[model samples]
Target: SGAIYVGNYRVVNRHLATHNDWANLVWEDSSRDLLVSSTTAQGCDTIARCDCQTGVYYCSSRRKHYPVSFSKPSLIFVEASEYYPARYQSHLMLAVGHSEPGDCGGILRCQHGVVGIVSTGGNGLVGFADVRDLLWLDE
Candidate 1:
């Protein structure tokens, strides 16, 4: 099941263990950066989309404003319907979701080349549950 959003970019290091230290700061987490960390700084990762536009909400995302490791970004208009296999279930990390609360999407935290999993509750509070499955779909 995919939520929605209004921006898009290609992740250039989903399998590399190198640091560029010059981009990506969607949400700065004292313990973990907010949103997906598919950029610079030790942060989070991606998801599908939902009732939103350009990742601009009460939540400010530097992701759309950062220097992507690849190319220049553009304006996208992804919307959400909250439908599909969501009626079904699986723990293999299916899709991402937003517009819920915090911990809305899956954040890919990596260390020594190992990417761990995380979630956001209300106000970037780290919590646990299946809503993590409902996690951030703003990939």
Candidate 2:
């Protein structure tokens, strides 16, 4: 809801497919090299006054960092608050955790690569779409 883009561009394609109950809404911009996706989580939070260090710790026993997809209850460490954002919730192929404003459309990544895309954040919770499902359409 609070997405802001200052550049000039054109839309290339919009994905509306609902295969396998995938919670997806992606738009391929004129530059095929870049893509944007949407999430059910709406609105934004207050901007952080300073840089915040955060990390998403997926449990080693259940899922590692390879496949790029994860289930619920992963540890989300927000710089502002650590204890509150430890558990991650996954629903309809989206990951829900603590996030803030200015984080929308950003990539959630770990040591290896990207994990998900920041969709929305507010009230100390942020829900993001899994980047693994993000793809391009032949036009």
Candidate 3:
């Protein structure tokens, strides 16, 4: 049998149509994982990382008004109900809507002295730093 990381993950509510609506919340390992809470027509959501060995999870958002290079790997997080601009250039057309986990690629590196986003494929970027003001919920 395969090891169960999240046992019995289910959606409480479906067919939600509105901005900032609570889509669903999942329960796993005695913890509550807010599945889909934001429904903004524009902007991208935050991304978080977890250390499986240490069982530590950190959440954060992307840096505002910064030029991101797409040539390298960058990682970023989106907080609940928060949205960010998804622009190909420094400031051009906006890629609206929230960004899913699979939207980007790159390894979740948890190291210090590293600045910039870690590409996670599909125009996704993860950051090693943390932003306290951007965090909507904490446990």
Q: What is the lDDT of residue 53 in candidate 2?
A: 28
C-alpha lDDT of all candidate models, in order:
0.24, 0.33, 0.23
lDDT of 3 at 8: 29
CA lDDT of 126 in candidate 2? 54
- Per-residue lDDT of candidate 1, residues 12-62 (tens digit): 212121243125423222122122223323333334322211121122232
**Which 10-residue span in candidate 3 carries the lowest summed lDDT?**
1-10
Using TM-score as the measure, the top candidate is: 2
The residue-level lDDT of candidate 3 at 114 comes to: 13
Cα RMSDs of all predictions?
Answer: 16.9, 15.2, 14.6
Off by over 4 Å in 2: 1-98, 135-139
* Runs off by more than 4 Å, candidate 1: 1-81, 91-102, 114-139
TM-score of each predicted structure versus truth: 0.19, 0.31, 0.18
**Cα displacement (Å) at residue 85, model 2:** 27
Question: What's each prediction's clash count?
Answer: 24, 0, 25
